[PDB]
Amino acid sequence: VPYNRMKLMIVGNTGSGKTTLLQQLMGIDVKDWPILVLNVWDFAGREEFYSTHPRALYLAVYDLSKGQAEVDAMKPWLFNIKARASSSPVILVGTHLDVSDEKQRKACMSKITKELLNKRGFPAIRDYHFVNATEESDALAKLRKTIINESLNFKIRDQLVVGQLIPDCYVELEKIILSERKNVPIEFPVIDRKRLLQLVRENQLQLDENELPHAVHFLNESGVLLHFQALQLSDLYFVEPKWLCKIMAQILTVGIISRRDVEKFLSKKRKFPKNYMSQYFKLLEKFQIALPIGEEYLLVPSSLSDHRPVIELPHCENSEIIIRLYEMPYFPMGFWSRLINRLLEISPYMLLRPNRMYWRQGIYLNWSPEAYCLVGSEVLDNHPESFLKITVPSCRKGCILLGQVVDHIDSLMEEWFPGLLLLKKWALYSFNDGEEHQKILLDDLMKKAEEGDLLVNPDQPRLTIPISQIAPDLILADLPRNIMLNNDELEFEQAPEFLLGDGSFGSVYRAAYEGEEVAVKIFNKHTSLRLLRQELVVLCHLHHPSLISLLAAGIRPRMLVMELASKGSLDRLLQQDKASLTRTLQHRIALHVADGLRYLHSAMIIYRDLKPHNVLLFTLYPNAAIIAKIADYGPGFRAPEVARGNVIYNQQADVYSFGLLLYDILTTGGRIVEGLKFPNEFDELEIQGKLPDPVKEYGCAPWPMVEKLIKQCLKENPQERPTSAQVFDILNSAELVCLTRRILLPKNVIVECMVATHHASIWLGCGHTDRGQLSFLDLNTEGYTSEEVADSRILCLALVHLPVEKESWIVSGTQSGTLLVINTEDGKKRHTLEKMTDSVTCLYCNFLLVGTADGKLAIFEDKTVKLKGAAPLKILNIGNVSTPLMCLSESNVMWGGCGTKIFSFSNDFTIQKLIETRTSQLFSYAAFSDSNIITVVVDTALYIAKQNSPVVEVWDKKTEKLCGLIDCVHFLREVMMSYSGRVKTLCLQKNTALWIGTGGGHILLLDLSTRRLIRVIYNFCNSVRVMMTAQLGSLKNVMLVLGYNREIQSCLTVWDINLPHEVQNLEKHIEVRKELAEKMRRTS
Ligand SMILES: Nc1nc2c(ncn2[C@@H]2O[C@H](COP(=O)(O)OP(=O)(O)O)[C@@H](O)[C@H]2O)c(=O)[nH]1
Ligand SMILES: [Mg+2]
């Protein structure tokens, strides 16, 4: 709809009469003026808004009776206007004509025809008038006509360039919002409830990702409300303009003042939340009201004395100091307060605190007679142009100070006062102490710097000056010793065959430095020096192992010598050698990139470019201290948020980009990268966020943990996405590396036993029901079936393998005592062996050993079990009706548990010793010692776990003695009723790893050679049921951990058998690099 509202900006200096001008025509006094409704902003006082937060017409008002001097005073105002809206209309109005002789009128008339109306650099004043008085006038009638017609003309001009007129149509929903924001009654008008207000007005502009940002954008430009977009009080805090302006302006007027006393006053004036108060102070900085000095003080630039304090500097002879001048036509408004804010952080030691003084128009830092710094404004007669003077003592520390000052000045101007980049840079020098200084432009000194000569007096050759004294910042004399270029080491040709690449900065060649391969950036005639120094500032102070460091810089040919990558960029590797891209290598690359991001984010630097083309590899050797680095720190791969082209980049954009990188790493084919070849789908795909399952879609081997990390990372909402610090923490995990698969079982399925086929599937029992039900899991497809095969509940399964006969059978022992034997190659071949006198408690198989609940051990001949109703070879009575067999271990002598005794068997099935373990109660606790044995692990000692024990007993089988206890509670006691500490199962690996499962979701990794805790693996599931060691169909060895996850959920987790080693190796890796980070940062 045809929006017909436009802003009127009235500017001028204090005492101009501009408010009364407005009155008759009809910090900032804001009121509507229906004529066309104008939103009139009367900048009554020094409202910095015109620089702190700069469809509008400008009315420039000045006092004619003051004259030409006032006209000149308006140049900064005009500059500022042009600097933010050169296309906007400007009407120049002189006032006080009734007390100003026409001499002044025509003097100022000629003044503006000579210096503003026909002068570039000012926003082409559209028209002008002179007014006698605000009583009324024909001049004012004409002015009103001018304002109206010109504002119409302006919007016509916008239609010619922008495409919008004074009835330009804007989405009506935005118009509605304006009205909704008008209707707001809040004591402390700070808005967050806007989300609700959207919901109050039905739900308009529902594209929160696009329409909402546009509405907000409009709301600031249209003069309705205020976002403050890196502040915390920014996005969710929309504030009434009247309060923002009023309160901050008042506090200025309510010069060093302690923060706390300001807080005291403010708390009485307006009871803001202390959180808001911290932001309040931050706003004072950003709006140039007050600058932070120490953490307890504010400078308050405005109102500082403007009578440069008497300062006597040490050093007096011309050769003792260095002087630099900046010639300007006028200082921009706010130039000084911004400059001061930057200069306050200067320090010659950053590579005692200074006695600082403030002039408003200058800063004096003291430190020491050895190194001090004075920056301030000075003006000479017959030279209208104002200008800066910088003075430092001529020595290395003085140089360092100078470098910092001029870098801040140039950066200030590039960001805030472009257009000037005027700024005539002069250096002062003399050929003899006691004489006057001579001026020279730095451009000419640069011409001489290229020659490398002394500055030579053209009239008298005997008089020369070593350039460095005049300009030690043209020659890079302020570099750290560590990066000064040694010209006897650097070896390069600049020949075509060494060209590695180029750009707007010049070109890059391959070279040698101190015997190493390096890359040399050359600033080949591209506004050099300034670009060079900008790069030097960024490169220094960033010293992380994952970044490309600087290996000396040199002004003689203007070079940056940097580290050259040995294996090249990731992108190439992805497309050229998947064999190198092992699972181990991939993980390490992810760590190194994550560190770089964490570091740069803590350094307040947004990378904005994470793609495979930017990742450099320095060795494919998986176990190296440094593998990947991020290039050039300081396309279709964009976050969907920033892809809109209407928001601001931040760490969350980088995080999203990282997630995509990780996705690209996961699928080593670079399948989405191949998608780039069809960019119309590729860029949109990323925008949609609808990425396909990396496993299913590309045929990529499973990698859980990472898979969910990517999903967690790539969220649509920036506030939901993980921080880069968190991303790293997640990547820093042995579990991440070694977890390979996780299969959930169907709801309400309880498996009490497992048999993996050693040849890729698992036979599962089922204790959920009370019926003999046998299930089956296909690891190749994660397929699952199940059928009832027996009456009573299946207790134990065993695999009979007869490779000689080319067949195998599953033996199912159950509660009834029967043995159901089923051919694995033929489900129809089912038969039952001689029924046992009690239930079957365990199976082992060659002989099929059947341990029953009455302590009886049946031994069946290897092949015999094929026949239905077959009887055992022999039967032994070990225990009794109350002492069941529960474990047959063998690692050809058997060992096992019977009640509280440990038995052992020969190859003739004779008892070789009955070790009563009840005597262990002399140690530990009798109710733990006196309990049925659950499992026996046979190594160089026996490891016994008893039912409901928290302690594992270690026995010396050679002497039958207790040789130690393992307290599981203790280990988890060190870890900060899920912590039952009950031991569930014991597995043993011959590399000394001992795997102990427990009641809660924890797995302890112990070191058998020292009996020490390697690591606690936890938050696995609710409870661990069984653990198996099994070789996969790929021949890879893994742990099969079956657990409960009560919602009776249960699941199978597959772990890489080398977990114990990965835990230790990873830990080492992380620590080594940690030390290197400190090494680098400390050198500086
Ligand atoms: N002689 C004369 N004085 C004026 C005229 N316009 C404004 N002034 C005086 O200027 C004062 C208004 O200043 P004001 O606009 O409040 O101050 P400012 O906002 O800082 O410029 C009143 O005293 C006016 O009488 C005029 O046309 N003729
Ligand atoms: Mg006023």
Curated annotation (Swiss-Prot):
Documented effect of changing K18A: GTPase-dead mutant. Loss of interaction with SEC16A and impaired ability to recruit SEC16A to endoplasmic reticulum exit sites
Effect of D632A: Loss of kinase activity. Decreases proteasomal degradation of MAPT. Loss of phosphorylation of RAB10
Residues where GTP binds: 12-19, 697-720, 880-883
UniProt superkingdom: Eukaryota
Residue ranges occupied by any Protein kinase domain in the UniProt entry: 494-737
Post-translational modification, as annotated: Ubiquitinated by TRIM1; undergoes 'Lys-48'-linked polyubiquitination leading to proteasomal degradation.
Outcome of substituting L1008I: In PARK8; shows decreased WD domain homodimerization; no effect on kinase activity
Phenotypic consequence of S978A: Decreases WD domain homodimerization
Mutation effect (R46Q): Decreased kinase activity
Boundaries of every Roc domain copy: 1-154
Start-end of each WD repeat: 738-778, 783-823, 828-861, 866-906, 912-956, 977-1007, 1012-1056
Disease: Parkinson disease 8: A slowly progressive neurodegenerative disorder characterized by bradykinesia, rigidity, resting tremor, postural instability, neuronal loss in the substantia nigra, and the presence of neurofibrillary MAPT (tau)-positive and Lewy bodies in some patients.
Subunit field text: Homodimer. Homotetramer; when activated by GTP-bound RAB29. Interacts with PRKN, PRDX3, and TPCN2. Interacts with VPS35. Interacts (via N-terminus) with RAB29; this interaction is direct and stimulates kinase activity. Interacts (via ROC domain) with SEC16A. Interacts with APP; interaction promotes phosphorylation of 'Thr-743' of APP. Interacts with MAPT. Interacts with RAB8A, RAB10, and RAB12. Interacts (via N-terminus) with RAB32.
Protein name per its UniProtKB record: Leucine-rich repeat serine/threonine-protein kinase 2
Organism annotation: Homo sapiens
This protein's encoding gene: LRRK2
Residues of the full protein shown: 1330 to 2525 of 2527
